[PDB]
Each structure stands twice: as C-alpha cells, then as structure tokens.
C-alpha cells in the first residue's frame, strides 16, 4: 500500500496543495467571502476536496503559534465509511488493493449520504445537494497507479507533503518526529496505525482542527 506523511512543522500555508488539487481535477471555485480570516474555502464541500485550515494560539512573548492544517481524507486502513455505506449498497465505496485508496464510486447517490459522513471519525465526506453523490480526496489514485506523486504532494515546496510505500513513510515519520521534537518538543504523529494520511502535529492535534485525530 501507499501512505502520505504530512510534516506540519514545515508548512508555510502557501496553499499550493489547495490550488493544485483543483487544477489536476479541473474542479470549480466556490463563492467565498472574507469573514475575518485568510482561511477560504472555510470548509470542505462537494467541489473542495482539500482546504488549508488556519488557527492562531496565543504564546508567551512576541508572535503566536500559527497552526496550519491542509485537510484531506485519511484513506483509513479499515474504512468506517465503507462499513456504513455497505449497509445500503456494496460498491458505492471500494478499497483499491494496489495503493490502499478509499474511493467513492458513482453508486454513492444510492446510499444514505448523511449517515456515511457521521460514520467517518474525521468528518471528511461531503454530499452534492443535486446528484446526492459523495466526494472527497481520492489520493489522486489516477496518478499514483501511473507511478506519479499526487498533485498536492508534488506541488508542496516545504517538504510537508511526502508520499510512497507505507513502510518507508512510517520509517520517515519516526526519523522526522525525532528531529522535529528538538524544535517542537510536544510533536506527535496522528493515528499512525489506523490511516494512510499520517499528520505530524507540532503540538495537541485538537489545536490544529477538532477532527485532526479519531
């Protein structure tokens, strides 16, 4: 299988990943407005598969801890969204055995879109108010199958986004956590046994986003 290692201690919130996702899939842009934040779009939706979340936490002395979270589907090893979806219709949510990608097919119109989002402990799935189909990050399975990096991984300049085989990524995450701890001593890996998107957080994952971990 394949795995994303996301080192958030290197993220500059450039949002190259956010734009690159929409470029590769030719997705449309939402109607957005500024409500007192750089964060936009404010949430994932049918047409936004990745958004960078901004969070400001007060620290002692000058400046802040500015916490950046490029949110995507975790592509869980044991997908709860599949388990729930398979109660309505088996096929709607399938698992690629090559890559480990959790993929929503066109049969997600048939299943209960509401409850399959509830089952997701990361609150990832989003419903089309029209076709009633579920959309999210598909791990750019298209590109991964063809021995290319996902768009968000390739576009990232900082070395935040890393992609490859589960073994060599977990090996990287452990070695990187060791060096990052010297700068951010409260650094941790998010659910490194349950998912294929392993986020390195500089501090309490709940500070980055409510559904940052299970």
């Amino acid at each position: 299988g394949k795995m994303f290692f996301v080192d958030l201690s290197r993220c500059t919130a450039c949002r190259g990943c956010q734009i690159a996702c929409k470029q590769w899939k030719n997705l449309p842009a939402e109607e957005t407005r500024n409500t007192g934040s750089h964060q936009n779009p404010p949430d994932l939706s049918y047409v936004t598969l990745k958004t960078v979340r901004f969070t400001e936490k007060s620290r002692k002395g000058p400046g802040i801890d500015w916490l950046f979270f490029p949110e995507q589907c975790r592509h869980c090893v044991e997908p709860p969204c599949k388990g729930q979806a398979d109660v309505d219709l088996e096929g709607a949510v399938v698992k690629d055995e090559t890559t480990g990608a959790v993929l929503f097919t066109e049969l997600t119109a048939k299943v209960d879109g509401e409850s399959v989002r509830s089952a997701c402990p990361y609150d990832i799935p989003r419903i089309d108010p029209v076709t009633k189909r579920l959309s999210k990050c598909d791990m750019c399975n298209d590109r991964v199958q063809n021995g290319l990096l996902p768009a968000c991984v390739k576009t990232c300049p900082t070395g935040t986004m890393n992609f490859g085989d589960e073994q060599e990524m977990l090996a990287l995450a452990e070695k990187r956590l060791a060096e990052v701890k010297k700068t951010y001593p409260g650094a941790v890996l998010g659910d490194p046994n349950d998912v294929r998107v392993v986020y390195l957080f500089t501090r309490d994952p709940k500070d980055f986003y409510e559904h940052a971990v299970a």
């Binding site: 500059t12 919130a13 450039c14 500024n34 750089h38 936009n40 063809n146 390739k154």
Partner: protein
Amino acid sequence: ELQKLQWAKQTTSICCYCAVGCGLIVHTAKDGQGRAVNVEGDPDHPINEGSLCPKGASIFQLGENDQRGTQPLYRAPFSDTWKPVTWDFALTEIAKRIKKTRDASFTEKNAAGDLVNRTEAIASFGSAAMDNEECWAYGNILRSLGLVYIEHQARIXHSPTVPALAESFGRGAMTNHWNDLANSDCILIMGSNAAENHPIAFKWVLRAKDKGATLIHVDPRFTRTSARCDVYAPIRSGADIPFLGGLIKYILDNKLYFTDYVREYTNASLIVGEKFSFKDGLFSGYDAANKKYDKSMWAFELDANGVPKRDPALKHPRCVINLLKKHYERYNLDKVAAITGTSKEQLQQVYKAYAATGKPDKAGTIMYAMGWTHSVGVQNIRAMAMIQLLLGNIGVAGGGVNALRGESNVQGSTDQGLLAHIWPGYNPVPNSKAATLELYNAATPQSKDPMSVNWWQNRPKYVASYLKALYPDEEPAAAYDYLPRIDAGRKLTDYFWLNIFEKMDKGEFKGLFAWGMNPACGGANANKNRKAMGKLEWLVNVNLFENETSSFWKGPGMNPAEIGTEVFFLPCCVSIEKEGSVANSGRWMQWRYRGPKPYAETKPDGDIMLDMFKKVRELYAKEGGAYPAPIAKLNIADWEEHNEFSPTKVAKLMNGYFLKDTEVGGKQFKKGQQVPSFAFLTADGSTCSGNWLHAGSFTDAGNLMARRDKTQTPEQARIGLFPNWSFCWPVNRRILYNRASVDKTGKPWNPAKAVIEWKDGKWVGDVVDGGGDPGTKHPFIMQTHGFGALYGPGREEGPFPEHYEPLECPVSKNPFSKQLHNPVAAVCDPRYPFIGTTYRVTEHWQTGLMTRRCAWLVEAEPQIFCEISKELAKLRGIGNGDTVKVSSLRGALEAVAIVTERIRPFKIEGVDVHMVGLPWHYGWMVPKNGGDTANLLTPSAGIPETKAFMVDVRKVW
C-alpha cells in the same frame, strides 16, 4: 497512461510570477495544435523540483481564461464604451499618434544649446513581465523614437538596492542564488516575507535548518514566514538602521568579525582624509541652505601614485575600520531596544546567533525584498552589506546579501535598461554635457593599483558594441548622436516613476505607454493618478485582460462623456503562449518554449512592439518628419524571422557576434561567429552586442540559457551551483565575489562548502569572479579600488549608515544625534492617527490584475481586508470580520476587519501607536465585492511611500 496528458504535446516553461524562476511542464492538446489541458511543476527543475506555490499552480486558469482580451479595443475621446477593431487599424492609428506627438515636441537641442535629440511629450511604464528579448527590443524602440521617460516596476527596489550594493560590492544584483540558501548556518529574513512572497525559497531555507541553521524573522507583523522561523523578533516600522547599527557595534565590541577577510578584502585598511568628520548627526561638508553634502570632504588620503593609502596593521586612527568602530559606539543595546521595541534579550539572542557566522567555516545570509527600503533605504541595505563584509559572508556558500527581486524578469528588464538613467548593461544614458562618445567614456574612474581589476574600464567596448548592434553600418561615435540624452542640469529623479505621475497631473504628457503595468492601481494616490490619466490625449495599454488602467475613464466617480483620452487596449498572450528568456533573482537566464498558440487574436509583446515600430518607420519614410535618422537606420531585420519577432535571433544579437575577422585576447575569431564572452568585445567596431552581460549566453556552442543539464562535480553538487542548468550573467558566475571565499593561496575559508578552489593551476567549482592567480588581484573587480566598501563615500546621506527617522508623525526623539530626520531630504493630520501599511499575501500578484481573474486564487482571498491588533479592535469597537472604513487625506475605502495577535501596538516615546495592515491586490474592475486598491489611501510625496502612511479606521454599521 494518464488520459488528461495522453495525446497532448509536453513542453517546458518558467513561472510568469515571482523572481524564484520555478520550472513548469505544459501539456498542449492535439500534439501542440490546440489549447493547454494541464500546467504543473517541472520535477527535473533544480530550484522548485516540481513544487509550485498557488500562483504558479494556477497558471492553467490564467491562460485558459474566457475573461482574457481577444482582439484590440479602441475608445474614442469622450466615448462611453469600447469599439472592437483590427490590429491593422490599432497599430496604424497608434503609429500616427506617436509621429504626430514626436514631430510636434521633438527638441534637437535643449535651452543650453546642447544636442539631446529627444521627446518629453511621451512617457512609457513597463515591464518586468515581458521576455528578456522583448524588454531589450522595447527599450531600443522607445529610445529610437527619442523617449527619456522610460520606467517600470524595478524603480521601487532599484533606487535603494542597486546604489547600496554597487557602492558596497561594485554590482547591484543578488550576490548568491536560491539553492545556495541551503548552505547557510544562520538566515536573517528582514524586510522580506519570503514564505508568502518567494514561497519556493523556503524549500531551501528549511533545508538550511535541517543541516543546523537558525532562521530569524525581523518583522513588525507575525506572518506565515514567522511561523516557520526559530526566532520571531518584532521591530517598529523604520527602526532597521538602529537594529543593524546595534549588530555592527556588537560584532566590533565582541571581536566577532572575520579579521583576515576584513584586512585583505574590505576597505578597512584604507586611510580616510583629515577633512572627514561626524558630529550631532551631520558628516563634514554639509551645505545647510541646499541640504546636501560636499562628498570631496569624505575622500581617501591618496599615496604618490593616486591609490588610496592603506595601513594593513589597522592601527592608524583614520583607517575605515577605526572610524567605523568610533561611528557605531552610540548603538548600545539599551538605545536600540528602546527605539526598535525589541527586548534586550531577543536583540542579544539574534546578535549572538548571526555574528557567530563571522567564523571562517560558518556562513550567514540576509534576505530582504521590498520591506521598507524611504530617504535612508539605501543606507539600510548599506548596513546589511557592511555586516556581511565584517563577518566575511560575501562570496561564500550560504552567505551574501540576497536582495530578492520581485517579478519573474525584473532583473532582465533592468538589465535591458527600461529605467530612465541606464541603457542595457548598466551603461548610463548620456546627459546633455556628454557631447561625444569619447567624453561619455571619459567619466569611467581609473585605478593606478595593479591588483585592482577595475573591470568597468572595458565600458568603451560595451558602449561601441551596443551602438553596432542598433546601427551596424555606422561608426559608434556617429551612432552615439541618434540616441536621446537627459538634461545634465536637472535632477536625475525628474525622469523617474513618481515625477512621471506629477508631470502627467500637470498635463505635460500627450502620450503614455502602459505596457504590462496597471498604474491606476500600482501608483500611490490612485485618485490623483486616475484623474491625471484624463489629461492625456492618448494612452496605449498592452495587457492580458481589460483593467483599471485601460478602463480608468469609466472608473469609480468618473464620467466618460467629459474625459477626452483616446485609449488603445492591445491584448498580449500569456507566458506559456510564447518562446524567450526570463532572468530570475539569481541572474539565471532561463529559456522557455511555446505550449498553446496565442489565445484568440492575442500577440506576443515582441510582435506588437515590432509591428507598431514598422508602421511608425513607414510613415516617416513617406511623410518625413522630425529627425528621422534614428528610426530609419535601427537594425530590426536582426530581430525578425519568417515575418515574425524572433526571440532566438534577438538573443543572439544580445549575446553579440563579430562583424569582421578579428584577433582578440590573442585568439583568432572568424566573421559572423557569436562572441563567446564580454572579455572578447572591442571598441573599434569589430564586434556587436545588445547587452555585454549576455555575451556568453548564446555562443557558437548554442543557447546556454536552454541547457537543462543537472551534471555537477562533487564540490559543485555540495553547494548546488548547477552550472550546466541554463546560464547566469556574468559568464555563469553563480556566486558573485567568490574570490573572497578563498585565502591568498586559493584555499577555501570553508572547505566543506567551497565555491572555488585553486587546484593544479586552475580555479575549480564555480566560474571565478575575476581571472588571475590566487592573491594577485583584489576580489571586488567591479569596484574602482577593488575592495568591499565598509566606508561608502558615494552615498548622498554619508559614507556610513546613520539612523534618521523615516516614521515622521509619531516620533519626535532621535536617541543617536541632534538630527531627527534625514539632513539631505508629511502633514500628520490628527484625524488620521494610525500607521497604514500595505503588503502582499501568497495567493495574489501585484495589483491583482492577473490573480483577481483566477477563480481559485479569489476563492482563497476573495476580498480586501484590514488586519488590526486586539488592542485597536477594543479601542475602536471592531469585531473579527466586521466591515470597516479606512481613510486618509488622499481617499477612503471599505474592507473586512481581521483582528489578530499577529499585529501588536508599537511603543513609541511612552505611547501605544497602532499599525493598520492592507493588501494592495484589489481593484474596482474585478471581482464583485473584491474592493478597490489600497493606493486610494497612499500619498504621492523618486519612489512612492506605501509601508508607512497615516490612516483612520472606523467600524461601518
């Protein structure tokens, strides 16, 4: 196979935004016959390695955009709407307006009776966005027509940077390059928001950290850069010179300077004349009435030969180093802390971290871009250069003054002399007193020092070779009379950006070229400028989309019916729809190729400007008119292939070729051969070259700018020179002043990060910056005396940076002298008590003309905002996300309030002073509810003031 990319032709490009120069791969439908289907990063490109920030990442949405211009548009005097017209009509009518204005205003001889052969009735703005070949051709077209008011983007950064670094090092350019940031042991980012404004640069900043480096951000605001640094140090706006002055004193007090480097390679040892002194914030030779200095009073004491006297013992009290120590004694931590608002603890921390790079086997780099670099902005950068010379960080891997250029080709556009004071290759524009070519060449200072290379002594070869590229059938001395001259008697700054807007408002301009710029948003005091454009008879706008400049006449508060300005809007093609080169901040001149054909009836800038000129030439050939010679004889046949502008042919003319069989440097050269280096150019007319800096870029071996070869020696690969990827001027010297990186033996100071090394009779690694055996030449070959200048007696404000207060309104006290404000230099209306500042975000570009048309970037940053502290929010009863009115003496606008701890009140003379932050990326044109330019608020009072202007911020209910 990936279906989206299957069947599409794959070509390479370079990003059309910032000066990092990120590689793209473009996929073009129908094997190159149709539209672009995909644009993403070039994985083989050694700067970005496939990475793109959201601007580069969104270039597909820029190019394949149905809001883009399709054909020329015309607007008749007082017309309420655009009238779509053909190219033939637009260029023809444009060519007639030029001739009408030229003939009517062309002055052969100024009042004083001196030859000038110029027009002062036509001005041109732009552009750093055009290809290098297009910038060169444009400059020459404008100069053949006799224009002197020729400016672009570069002015805002040039005026501070180039004179600061030229004075210090002998060249004005970024000393190192992006990949080299990775070799640095301490990175000081100060007057830069690189994480947002040069994003791919942070690939190499973070890799510097991985290998042990400390990253320091010095900024009044906490940014996305600050979040990824080891040390965030807040600084009060305009307290930079105090801060750097404290660092100089810290380095000298604690003996942290690189002694051998300083004694040999800087001017530390040179004896300043007895006439030099400093007292009460004034240097010697001050004229109180005129408010300027007699710089002869700052001269060096010359020996019998005429060479500045030196004490290698550094004992003489008039040694530069000893006068430096004296001058900066006053910048103690207590005074610097009080004025900067930086804690003594953090100052000591930052000072200790960075001055540790004075170690011969450690390298420190300073990164600055625009920041706030006003009256003493030149002296700010001088202090950075002086710190780097003290620590011996100039010429070494991970060192240098990395003065980050803004636009993709602002380096190239400057190199092609699209500023009023310079021809291509930084040969000055002649003034009225420079009556002959011999007199022009007489102005170059000479050195009697045999160790001093003084390379600028070759200038006559470059000027002659230049005039032979434009006018190859004439003698250089004869051709010299064709090109216009500025008034020797007038201030140089009267020909610059800010006075072009002043003159325009006084209706002293008939015509303006707005070529790849948006003045109506870019210019400070937008209300004034938008009204001033109404006083033009004709305006030529060449851009990708309809914009605030093209359509100023139907702008906010405007009435088309009573605006008589005749506008031609010519739609140019995007970067991926044409071939050519762009020169990045690191001087990497990078060849890119056509993907899709020009969208609709759009044209490359080369074809627009060349076709426009040919129609002007045609009119003069049939009608005659004012002094036709320069227009008639200009060699545009070398610019053209298959009835079209040839990027390839212009690039070969810019590199240059021998016009006859010539013997140079004791080597035979055949006629028609490409000149292989500027070393082999001549003054006798044997050679031509559009730009001597390009001599070496396109040789008989081919187009070196189009090299995509990642081949590196171990010592090259250790510091990421990539000398076989594209070509950088001068002659592929990737790190400038690299002779300073080795002792008089030729051994590196830092063998683990060698730039050059003397091995077996040759320099190995980078190309040596100046030929000659180890210890036989002074390392700064473009300097007259050959030394890194700690003492700079050519600067208007004095030979040492001194704190003079740039932030007028809230400051009354200078703790360093009697002299509050700059002695060679605002209303402060109490109704506007806050410091307005303007800056960028990652997702938008310049005035936003380009990025406001890209839906994915509008998605991320849809509206103008006003960032304010929690303290100012509490004072003015503003909540996060509330609509506010920001106002000044110049205008007012509405924006969304972002309340953030990233902004903190300045503490100035026992008072809380609140700073108000606005993005200048917005304009009335597009999008809906996006907002208008923050330059509605900025004052006019030759560079505009955009970082500190007075505002009020009120909540709107």
